[PDB]
Amino acid sequence: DYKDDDDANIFEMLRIDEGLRLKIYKDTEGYYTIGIGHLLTKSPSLNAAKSELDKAIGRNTNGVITKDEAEKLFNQDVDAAVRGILRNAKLKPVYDSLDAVRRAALINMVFQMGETGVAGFTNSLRMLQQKRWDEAAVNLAKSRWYNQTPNRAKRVITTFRTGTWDAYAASQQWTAGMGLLMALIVLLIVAGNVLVIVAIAKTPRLQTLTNLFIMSLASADLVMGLLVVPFGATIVVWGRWEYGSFFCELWTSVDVLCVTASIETLCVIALDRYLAITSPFRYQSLLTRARARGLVCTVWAISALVSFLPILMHWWRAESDEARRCYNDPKCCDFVTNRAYAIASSVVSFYVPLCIMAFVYLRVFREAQKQVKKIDSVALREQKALKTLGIIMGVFTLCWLPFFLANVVKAFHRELVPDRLFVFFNWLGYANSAFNPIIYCRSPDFRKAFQGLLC
Ligand SMILES: CC(C)CCC[C@@H](C)[C@H]1CC[C@H]2[C@@H]3CC=C4C[C@@H](O)CC[C@]4(C)[C@H]3CC[C@]12C
Ligand SMILES: CC(C)NC[C@H](O)COc1cccc2[nH]c3ccccc3c12
Ligand code: NA
């Protein structure tokens, strides 16, 4: 029938906003429920609920149904909302003035708040019936509704404002696009870094002292691909933190830990190659294989101290409205910090290692020119291995310097960094966990090592 597609459209709107379940389940109050919030019965008996389902559906479902049958239930719930809207003196005149798309927005609010809940938006309702859409969208956003479910509320409010479905089309392709891209990013990180660890760990040719440090660097990248990036992607895709306040702080701590360990490992590398080329005899006299393992544990030990300790102590916390409402919402895991912590933490964990790692390695890179004023083909074999260390140090500074310059600009004046931009700089740094294994293939020894392990 020519009216069928409007029922499918509003069904898909709420499918995105409330979700869909095709098997009977208990709602938070414990009543048997299926579909998009269709409450089957308040009776405790499960068979009474399947009985009510089989009546509405016209077959013996055994408590399982198809998408199309879930839409059949939902059309009945939509009729009940319309009846309630039509009997509410504040909502009926607005509903009568709206087209199908804006009626779907209003019906969607009714599913979330109820008629009385929507009826309390007395000024926004006046602006809708007055077709002052942009002003209705502003007043609607000034609400606890908007603050508690901003993703759904932005979509509904955009729908009242434009009169289109574009916010729901934009969402559904965002979940598919970014859901896929994030999946590939987690695999490219876990794949490239798991290979680098096993290659150095079981290739005798690769068991270089510098490769002992690179295994620390790849070990940081692998925790990123296992315990950090996968969970930060759910925020980028789902629009909220699903794992509670406790795992929010732990995730944040491991995230700060791995980044702090990486720049410190790059700094220890630059200090290793500087001692190696300025004082070779002290290098042989000082660095045993076991002491090199001690530097790694000391780096992670300093990193966990400078990462876990401030975070578990809540030294980072701020008093702003943005900060307190996130701290009191488990669904929010934004890392809102006080201006003091934003500086001291990023300086101790990053700028200081970045300057030493950048200052020392340049004096390393110039002394090699000071000792090789010649043309040579075998020199290319050693300029290449030195260049690889300067690429990894460079790609790290590129992937993460913007995130930390914005972090200090954000501290003095939040005006300048959009949250959209700051999140993008943070994912430029997450991408570094992918690049390193690719850069490790620049050297011939890793190259034949990767090629043998894959067959
Ligand atoms: C995700 C968090 C909570 C766990 C942290 C993992 C810790 C234990 C990791 C980080 C880097 C790892 C070190 C890096 C590589 C080496 C060199 C290897 O030849 C011996 C072990 C040693 C020294 C690792 C010990 C374990 C280690 C310190
Ligand atoms: C989603 C958020 C939690 N991700 C954090 C960054 O990946 C890494 O952030 C840091 C690493 C090391 C030191 C740091 N000091 C900071 C101050 C503010 C924000 C991040 C950091 C930070
Ligand atoms: Na929170």
XYZ file of C-alpha atoms and ligand atoms in Angstrom:
506
model
C 0.000 0.000 0.000
C 1.165 3.520 -0.747
C 1.302 4.299 3.005
C 3.570 1.345 3.855
C 6.883 3.146 3.338
C 6.092 5.740 6.032
C 5.704 2.919 8.545
C 9.059 1.457 7.510
C 10.741 4.872 7.766
C 9.633 5.609 11.305
C 10.481 2.014 12.249
C 14.032 2.463 10.975
C 14.324 5.781 12.822
C 13.594 4.166 16.185
C 15.630 1.107 15.265
C 18.626 3.442 15.175
C 17.529 5.367 18.278
C 16.295 2.568 20.595
C 17.619 -0.609 18.955
C 15.887 -3.811 17.908
C 15.618 -7.251 19.477
C 14.034 -10.248 17.786
C 13.925 -12.571 20.821
C 11.834 -12.057 23.944
C 13.740 -10.404 26.784
C 13.006 -8.747 30.107
C 13.005 -4.953 30.234
C 14.808 -3.225 33.086
C 11.667 -3.461 35.227
C 11.472 -7.167 34.333
C 8.444 -7.287 32.037
C 8.636 -9.484 28.946
C 9.369 -7.383 25.877
C 10.328 -7.837 22.212
C 10.912 -5.778 19.077
C 11.496 -2.084 19.678
C 10.232 -1.811 23.221
C 6.992 -3.695 22.622
C 5.888 -4.866 26.067
C 4.118 -8.194 25.728
C 2.633 -8.579 29.210
C 3.222 -7.703 32.817
C 2.539 -11.355 33.701
C 5.541 -13.187 35.216
C 4.838 -16.278 33.074
C 7.033 -16.557 29.997
C 4.383 -18.705 28.309
C 1.816 -15.961 28.863
C 4.202 -13.597 27.063
C 4.787 -15.961 24.128
C 1.013 -16.428 24.078
C 0.522 -12.667 23.746
C 3.200 -12.580 21.047
C 1.608 -15.386 19.036
C -1.719 -13.554 19.229
C -0.332 -10.278 17.867
C 1.800 -12.009 15.206
C -0.570 -14.734 13.977
C 1.757 -17.733 14.336
C 3.593 -19.803 16.977
C 6.755 -17.691 17.311
C 8.228 -19.422 20.377
C 9.401 -15.931 21.345
C 11.422 -15.310 18.152
C 10.334 -13.013 15.323
C 11.530 -11.421 12.093
C 12.313 -7.773 11.423
C 9.082 -7.387 9.456
C 7.020 -8.874 12.294
C 8.777 -6.549 14.734
C 7.615 -3.693 12.511
C 4.076 -5.065 12.710
C 4.196 -4.709 16.498
C 5.795 -1.280 16.212
C 3.001 0.092 14.005
C 0.574 -0.715 16.820
C 2.742 1.135 19.332
C 2.915 4.064 16.912
C -0.892 4.140 16.742
C -1.032 4.295 20.547
C 1.375 7.229 20.580
C -0.733 9.029 17.986
C -3.881 8.473 20.043
C -2.147 9.905 23.082
C -0.850 12.865 21.106
C -4.308 13.546 19.704
C -5.801 13.569 23.220
C -3.187 15.977 24.652
C -4.272 19.581 24.155
C -0.705 20.867 23.954
C 0.475 18.233 21.455
C -2.530 17.846 19.119
C -2.312 21.315 17.480
C 1.439 20.807 16.872
C 0.953 17.298 15.501
C -1.793 18.552 13.165
C 0.558 21.176 11.673
C 3.495 18.835 10.983
C 4.359 16.693 7.966
C 5.162 12.984 8.216
C 8.878 13.501 8.878
C 8.420 16.022 11.699
C 5.572 13.945 13.085
C 8.067 11.084 13.275
C 10.368 13.297 15.362
C 7.536 14.164 17.764
C 6.426 10.525 17.965
C 10.027 9.601 18.674
C 10.175 11.999 21.627
C 6.906 10.491 22.866
C 8.512 7.050 22.869
C 11.373 8.388 24.979
C 9.532 10.763 27.402
C 5.808 10.071 27.012
C 3.108 12.536 26.020
C 3.366 14.460 29.293
C 7.133 14.620 28.921
C 6.932 16.125 25.439
C 4.020 18.288 26.578
C 6.361 20.121 28.982
C 8.382 21.607 26.086
C 5.800 24.371 25.910
C 7.940 26.952 24.103
C 9.472 24.530 21.597
C 5.981 23.260 20.757
C 4.855 26.835 20.104
C 7.764 27.343 17.737
C 7.034 24.107 15.852
C 3.377 24.959 15.240
C 4.681 28.408 14.275
C 7.194 26.712 11.900
C 10.092 28.584 13.564
C 12.253 25.514 13.166
C 15.700 26.834 14.080
C 14.345 28.423 17.256
C 12.519 25.219 18.167
C 15.795 23.342 17.720
C 17.591 25.709 20.096
C 15.052 25.431 22.904
C 14.856 21.648 22.467
C 18.628 21.367 22.949
C 18.449 23.237 26.287
C 17.290 20.134 28.106
C 18.334 17.243 30.291
C 17.093 15.059 27.416
C 19.727 16.509 25.110
C 22.432 16.135 27.757
C 21.637 12.529 28.653
C 21.163 11.170 25.088
C 22.902 13.750 22.866
C 23.247 11.439 19.844
C 19.549 10.578 19.618
C 18.552 14.105 20.618
C 20.707 15.727 17.940
C 19.171 13.438 15.318
C 15.594 14.147 16.445
C 16.277 17.876 16.710
C 17.926 17.949 13.279
C 14.799 16.219 11.958
C 12.487 18.924 13.337
C 14.810 21.539 11.888
C 15.442 20.312 8.347
C 12.328 18.234 7.787
C 14.454 15.459 6.251
C 15.918 12.101 7.267
C 19.492 13.229 6.617
C 20.612 12.861 10.232
C 19.515 9.226 10.200
C 21.115 8.549 6.815
C 24.296 10.219 8.049
C 24.231 8.037 11.150
C 23.604 4.707 9.435
C 26.504 5.169 7.010
C 28.728 6.446 9.841
C 28.138 3.234 11.780
C 28.969 1.184 8.684
C 31.854 3.269 7.369
C 33.675 3.979 10.619
C 32.678 0.600 12.013
C 34.589 -1.047 9.169
C 37.525 1.351 9.173
C 38.000 0.939 12.918
C 37.923 -2.830 12.482
C 40.694 -2.698 9.883
C 42.759 -0.334 12.031
C 42.665 -2.637 15.046
C 43.786 -5.569 12.880
C 46.575 -3.727 11.087
C 47.920 -2.669 14.499
C 47.596 -6.072 16.158
C 48.899 -7.840 13.044
C 51.941 -5.670 12.388
C 52.995 -5.527 16.033
C 52.396 -9.182 16.865
C 54.690 -10.010 13.942
C 57.406 -7.600 15.082
C 57.536 -9.174 18.538
C 57.727 -12.776 17.345
C 60.272 -11.879 14.656
C 62.698 -10.247 17.076
C 61.923 -12.865 19.729
C 62.825 -15.888 17.573
C 65.221 -14.555 14.929
C 68.787 -14.709 16.300
C 69.944 -12.217 13.680
C 67.353 -9.713 14.936
C 68.165 -9.938 18.651
C 69.962 -6.585 18.532
C 70.122 -4.384 21.610
C 68.215 -1.712 19.690
C 65.654 -4.352 18.740
C 65.223 -5.032 22.456
C 64.002 -1.442 22.676
C 61.928 -1.765 19.511
C 60.197 -4.740 21.097
C 59.247 -2.394 23.935
C 57.942 0.072 21.366
C 56.013 -2.624 19.521
C 54.840 -3.935 22.890
C 53.324 -0.517 23.557
C 51.722 -0.494 20.119
C 50.227 -3.934 20.733
C 48.513 -2.887 23.951
C 47.081 0.021 21.947
C 45.553 -2.347 19.418
C 44.207 -4.707 22.077
C 43.070 -2.616 25.042
C 42.836 1.011 23.887
C 42.042 1.604 20.211
C 39.299 -1.049 20.118
C 37.548 0.660 23.026
C 38.156 4.189 21.792
C 36.617 3.187 18.456
C 33.365 2.234 20.189
C 33.160 5.842 21.369
C 33.745 7.160 17.848
C 31.105 4.789 16.437
C 28.511 4.261 19.172
C 28.844 7.812 20.485
C 29.159 6.747 24.127
C 31.129 4.686 26.635
C 29.461 1.333 27.348
C 31.797 -0.181 29.950
C 31.184 1.760 33.174
C 33.133 4.320 35.157
C 35.765 1.872 36.417
C 36.929 0.619 33.030
C 36.727 4.224 31.840
C 39.530 5.234 34.209
C 41.496 2.042 33.559
C 41.257 2.482 29.791
C 42.349 6.104 30.178
C 45.280 5.012 32.334
C 46.529 2.351 29.923
C 46.124 4.876 27.099
C 48.328 7.428 28.860
C 50.680 4.618 29.893
C 51.374 3.310 26.392
C 51.956 6.759 24.905
C 54.291 7.670 27.758
C 56.169 4.394 27.344
C 56.591 4.925 23.601
C 58.186 8.374 23.609
C 60.368 7.257 26.520
C 61.471 4.193 24.550
C 62.300 6.416 21.577
C 64.252 8.688 23.908
C 66.202 5.779 25.394
C 66.951 4.678 21.831
C 68.292 8.114 20.921
C 70.405 8.058 24.095
C 71.563 4.532 23.243
C 72.682 5.405 19.724
C 74.335 8.582 21.013
C 76.472 6.714 23.538
C 77.106 4.035 20.905
C 78.670 6.486 18.440
C 80.339 9.049 20.743
C 81.962 6.715 23.309
C 82.034 3.188 21.865
C 84.207 1.755 24.636
C 81.929 2.995 27.421
C 79.075 1.488 25.406
C 80.693 -1.957 25.462
C 81.781 -1.430 29.082
C 78.342 -0.466 30.430
C 75.463 -2.095 28.529
C 75.095 -5.771 29.344
C 72.156 -7.704 27.929
C 70.556 -7.770 31.394
C 71.017 -4.045 32.007
C 69.204 -3.384 28.729
C 66.271 -5.346 30.127
C 66.534 -3.142 33.209
C 66.151 0.035 31.175
C 62.921 -1.311 29.703
C 61.435 -2.096 33.103
C 62.581 1.294 34.383
C 60.860 3.037 31.461
C 57.542 1.269 31.991
C 57.943 1.761 35.731
C 58.367 5.513 35.291
C 55.528 5.501 32.767
C 53.045 3.749 35.046
C 54.080 6.081 37.853
C 53.472 9.208 35.751
C 50.296 7.762 34.193
C 48.436 5.546 36.681
C 49.284 7.539 39.805
C 47.827 10.942 38.774
C 44.754 9.274 37.253
C 43.924 6.990 40.172
C 44.453 10.001 42.464
C 42.032 12.108 40.364
C 44.636 14.881 40.251
C 43.392 15.582 36.705
C 39.789 16.355 37.647
C 38.170 19.734 36.978
C 35.166 21.516 38.483
C 33.478 22.779 35.296
C 29.947 21.914 34.260
C 31.401 19.896 31.391
C 33.681 17.976 33.760
C 31.288 17.230 36.600
C 28.483 16.033 34.327
C 30.892 13.615 32.615
C 32.309 12.353 35.929
C 28.769 11.638 37.134
C 27.694 9.903 33.888
C 29.142 6.396 33.330
C 28.255 6.718 29.642
C 30.686 9.659 29.376
C 34.395 8.821 29.218
C 35.715 12.098 27.861
C 39.079 12.900 29.432
C 38.146 16.317 30.784
C 41.097 17.639 32.780
C 42.032 20.742 34.729
C 44.383 23.185 32.996
C 47.214 22.363 35.417
C 47.150 18.621 34.696
C 46.807 19.259 30.971
C 50.215 20.960 31.043
C 52.248 19.123 33.644
C 51.145 15.705 32.431
C 51.787 16.403 28.757
C 55.152 17.963 29.646
C 56.385 15.133 31.872
C 55.033 12.372 29.627
C 55.821 13.905 26.233
C 57.493 17.281 25.675
C 60.566 16.507 27.782
C 61.162 13.110 26.092
C 60.323 14.689 22.732
C 63.015 17.353 23.153
C 65.736 15.025 24.421
C 64.784 12.436 21.804
C 64.836 15.151 19.121
C 67.886 17.063 20.373
C 70.094 14.048 21.041
C 69.241 12.169 17.853
C 70.047 15.189 15.681
C 73.514 15.408 17.236
C 73.722 11.685 16.511
C 72.595 12.179 12.918
C 75.201 14.918 12.335
C 78.188 13.097 13.865
C 77.650 10.304 11.337
C 78.184 12.881 8.590
C 81.225 14.175 10.488
C 82.812 10.704 10.354
C 81.882 9.729 6.773
C 83.000 12.390 4.282
C 83.184 9.860 1.454
C 81.226 8.291 -1.392
C 80.435 4.632 -0.736
C 77.931 1.891 -1.556
C 78.347 -0.073 1.691
C 77.781 3.199 3.563
C 74.222 3.080 2.210
C 73.804 -0.140 4.200
C 74.473 1.844 7.401
C 72.836 5.153 6.463
C 69.698 3.075 5.894
C 69.637 1.531 9.372
C 70.264 4.945 10.935
C 67.583 6.526 8.753
C 65.031 3.991 10.009
C 65.511 5.223 13.577
C 65.037 8.807 12.402
C 61.870 7.926 10.499
C 60.257 6.227 13.492
C 61.141 9.213 15.657
C 59.754 11.534 12.992
C 56.521 9.668 12.321
C 55.907 9.557 16.063
C 56.360 13.314 16.359
C 54.006 13.867 13.426
C 51.300 11.502 14.655
C 51.337 12.937 18.198
C 52.731 16.485 18.167
C 49.428 17.988 16.891
C 47.511 16.219 19.666
C 49.775 17.713 22.347
C 50.049 21.195 20.864
C 46.258 21.335 20.726
C 46.209 19.951 24.270
C 48.133 22.981 25.563
C 46.256 25.433 23.324
C 43.064 23.797 24.603
C 44.190 24.421 28.175
C 44.635 28.197 28.023
C 41.776 28.853 25.594
C 39.308 26.070 24.853
C 37.888 28.374 22.176
C 40.380 27.272 19.538
C 40.147 23.459 19.370
C 36.801 21.922 18.344
C 36.106 18.611 20.013
C 35.797 17.231 16.492
C 39.360 18.367 15.773
C 40.914 17.258 19.052
C 39.473 13.771 18.586
C 40.987 13.653 15.105
C 44.460 14.553 16.367
C 44.060 11.801 18.965
C 43.410 9.263 16.211
C 46.410 10.513 14.269
C 48.416 9.339 17.271
C 46.561 6.041 17.470
C 47.540 5.514 13.825
C 51.209 5.529 14.826
C 50.664 2.070 16.317
C 50.049 0.933 12.714
C 52.858 2.710 11.058
C 55.740 1.329 13.046
C 55.568 -2.281 11.767
C 55.463 -0.888 8.239
C 58.560 1.211 8.947
C 60.297 -1.825 10.466
C 60.169 -3.442 7.019
C 62.504 -0.747 5.700
C 65.545 -2.696 6.984
C 66.536 -5.868 5.067
C 66.841 -8.021 8.191
C 63.228 -7.528 9.264
C 62.168 -7.841 5.619
C 63.387 -11.411 5.170
C 62.247 -12.120 8.738
C 58.634 -11.140 8.032
C 58.724 -12.980 4.708
C 59.813 -16.260 6.301
C 57.217 -16.228 9.077
C 54.315 -15.743 6.640
C 55.129 -18.356 3.965
C 48.880 -3.495 29.421
C 49.728 -3.310 30.665
C 48.815 -3.201 31.873
C 50.740 -4.430 30.815
C 52.155 -3.917 30.598
C 53.039 -4.954 29.920
C 54.479 -4.972 30.424
C 54.660 -6.104 31.412
C 55.420 -5.118 29.244
C 55.662 -3.786 28.559
C 56.968 -3.961 27.788
C 57.425 -5.351 28.150
C 58.909 -5.541 28.143
C 59.385 -5.207 26.752
C 60.288 -6.280 26.215
C 61.053 -7.025 27.011
C 62.360 -7.549 26.503
C 62.215 -9.048 26.509
O 63.362 -9.621 25.891
C 62.083 -9.437 27.977
C 60.819 -8.860 28.626
C 60.618 -7.368 28.390
C 61.452 -6.559 29.360
C 59.152 -6.988 28.485
C 58.550 -7.293 29.848
C 57.048 -7.032 29.856
C 56.829 -5.586 29.498
C 57.514 -4.689 30.489
C 40.842 9.159 24.825
C 41.990 9.745 25.652
C 41.930 9.322 27.119
N 43.261 9.324 25.090
C 44.529 9.763 25.664
C 45.638 9.876 24.612
O 45.618 8.767 23.731
C 46.983 9.937 25.293
O 46.990 11.008 26.214
C 48.047 11.326 27.009
C 49.204 10.538 27.034
C 50.281 10.866 27.848
C 50.245 11.985 28.660
C 49.146 12.793 28.679
N 48.813 13.942 29.359
C 47.551 14.348 28.990
C 46.734 15.399 29.338
C 45.474 15.517 28.758
C 45.013 14.589 27.829
C 45.800 13.517 27.451
C 47.056 13.385 28.014
C 48.018 12.445 27.825
Na 32.373 9.341 33.132
